[PDB]
Every structure is written in structure tokens, then in C-alpha cells.
Amino acid sequence: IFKPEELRQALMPTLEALYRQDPESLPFRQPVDPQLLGIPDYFDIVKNPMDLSTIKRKLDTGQYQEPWQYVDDVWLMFNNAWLYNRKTSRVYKFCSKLAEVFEQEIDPVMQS
């Protein structure tokens, strides 16, 4: 059993860690807009879009009852980017960096 605000305080530093990464978090800070980004097939491929702003809003409105639900949304965001983008993409490579940062940050948090 987790109290939403307690979980939020525990998890927020990990989300902050992602946001802190500049430029690597920039493609992830707002929801993908396929028309703006010149990726018109995006919503065909990515059925379950996720971004940092969405994760933050879920965290802030207590929609994560349990820490793995948060972790699952972070990895959803990563997996979407790896799925849509080519390995040669700026976004793909940025995503890989974010995943490294996240793993490094979420580990000591889950322990606590």
C-alpha cells in the first residue's frame, strides 16, 4: 500500500533527472505532434503515446497507486521512441541516454 503523495515525493527526483538532461530530454518533454514534427505516420505506429509532461501530470494528480505503474509509463515512453525512430536518429540516441539516466536514478529510489 502506497500513499500517492508519499510515492510522488519518492519518484519525483527520478522524473527531475530525466528533465535535467539537456538536450536529451527535449524530444520527450511534450507529447509528440506528428504534423509539427514531420512524422505523419506516428499515430499509426505508436498506439500508446507517452511523454514526460503526461507522466508528470499523472504523478501530480496521484494516478500512480504503485511505483511500478510509474516505471511502466517511463519505459513506455522509451519503448515508443525506440520503436518509431531509426537507430540513427537523434531521438533514438537521446532516448538511450535517458534510459541509462533513469536506470541509474530509479535503482536507489526503489531500494528506499
Ligand X SMILES: CCOc1ccc(C(C)=O)cc1NC(=O)c1cccc(C(=O)O)c1
18 lies in the binding site for ligand X (CB under 6 A)? no
38 sits in the region (left: phi over 0; alpha: psi -120 to 50; else beta) called left
Cell of 47: 498506439
Q: Assess contact for 99 and 78: CB atoms under 8 A.
A: yes
Instruction: Tell me the window of 10-18, 57-65, 80-88, 100-108 that interacts with ligand X (CB under 6 A).
Output: 80-88
Spatial distance between the Cα atoms of 89 and 93, rounded to a whole number of angstroms: 6
Q: Which of 91, 98, 99, 106: binder of ligand X (CB under 6 A)? A: 91
Residue 29, SS3 per DSSP: coil
Comparing CB distances to ligand X, the nearer of 4 and 79 is 79
Q: Is 73 in the site for ligand X (CB under 6 A)?
A: no
In the complex, the residues that contact ligand X under the rule CB under 6 A are: 23, 26-28, 32, 37, 39, 81, 84-85, 91
